[PDB]
């Protein structure tokens, strides 16, 4: 089998993107974002806390007849950027692009916190990194990625993801006519439960491309691109006027500015990132300063290869018994 769905960014800055999902019987079609960095598949429902719904659409696991609550289940997750849910547990019918699995883990959010109320365009997240990070208790349940694997006809995702447009999320298949040249593959470790992958370097628009290991995670939840303090600043230094501003929380630059690219390496190969890409546009409604898009890692404890390094490629998560992951231009 396979399933192909289009993702679409939720604002004009491509903050994050959502993806319609299909749960339940009959269908309840809720817009979820498909994080590669997180393992739990968690829903605005019925159940959430009546004053942290603000527009969500929920899931009402009553008007499923194929629901079953998972006895005894409870799940509860904190995420990178501070935000948290919690809630308790069925399994459903999940339908994502044409691809159905059964029995899969839908956690019920009883909690979220104030981002996620303030978000009126997601539902809920879909987690696509691997099955030990999903936190349900006291019986960890699988993404469905994992649920859907043996079903697929090869044992992959694909994320391709559009800068300021739509994009697809497609399983069991890679799409050839979707990128140029070649995929080039490299490794993972799993051991954080991440897709984490080694970069070999990275160049600042028209410079020479420096070759350094930089450890990282591909993705998809989040949203900008996090590396060491020393490759940010080497970025932010050919910005006339950019700056790293503790107040407002990272670098900023002048509106004004036109951005060089940047280049990441993915073994022999590389991919570029333009400079629009990196541009998060006004810190307030009518600010000149403008939010960058490539910030340090340092503090958060790992490199992250969010949407904007992601959206300038075709990005295969190689879900094979020894996972890959593998990056095309586009």
């Not at 769905?5 to 974002?33: F, M, R």
């Not at 990625?145 to 043996?150: G, V, Y």
């Not at 070759?211 to 020393?230: E, H, Q």
């Amino acid at each position: 089998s396979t399933g192909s769905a289009t993702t679409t960014p939720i604002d004009s800055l491509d903050d994050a993107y959502i993806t319609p999902v299909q749960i339940g019987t009959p269908a309840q079609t809720l817009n979820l974002d498909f994080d590669t960095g997180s393992s739990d598949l968690w829903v605005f429902s019925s159940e959430t806390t009546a004053s942290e719904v603000d527009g969500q659409t929920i899931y009402t696991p009553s008007k499923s007849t194929t629901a079953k609550l998972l006895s005894g289940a409870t799940w509860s997750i904190s995420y990178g950027d501070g935000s948290s849910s919690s809630g308790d547990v069925y399994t459903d019918t999940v339908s994502v692009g044409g691809l159905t699995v059964t029995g899969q883990a839908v956690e019920s959010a009883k909690k979220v916190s104030s981002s996620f109320t303030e978000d009126s365009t997601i539902d809920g997240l879909l987690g696509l990194a691997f099955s030990t990070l999903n936190t349900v208790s006291p019986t960890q349940q699988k993404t469905f990625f994992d649920n859907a694997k043996a079903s697929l006809d090869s044992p992959v995702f694909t994320a391709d993801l559009g800068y300021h447009a739509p994009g697809t999320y497609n399983f069991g298949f890679i799409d050839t006519t979707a990128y140029t040249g070649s995929i080039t593959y490299t490794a993972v470790s799993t051991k954080q439960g991440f897709w984490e992958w080694t970069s070999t370097g990275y160049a600042v628009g028209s410079g020479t491309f420096k070759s350094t290991s930089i450890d990282g995670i591909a993705d998809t939840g989040t949203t900008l691109l996090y590396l060491p303090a020393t490759v940010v600043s080497a970025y932010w230094a050919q910005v006339s006027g950019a700056k790293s501003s503790s107040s407002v929380g990272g670098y900023v630059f002048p509106c004004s500015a036109t951005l060089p690219s940047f280049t990441f390496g993915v073994g022999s190969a590389r991919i570029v990132i333009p400079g629009d890409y990196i541009d998060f546009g006004p810190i307030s409604t009518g600010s000149s300063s403008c939010f960058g898009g490539i910030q340090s890692s340092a503090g958060i404890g790992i490199n992250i290869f969010g949407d904007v390094a992601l959206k300038a490629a075709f990005v295969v998560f190689n879900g094979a018994t020894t996972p890959t992951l593998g990056f095309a231009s586009k």
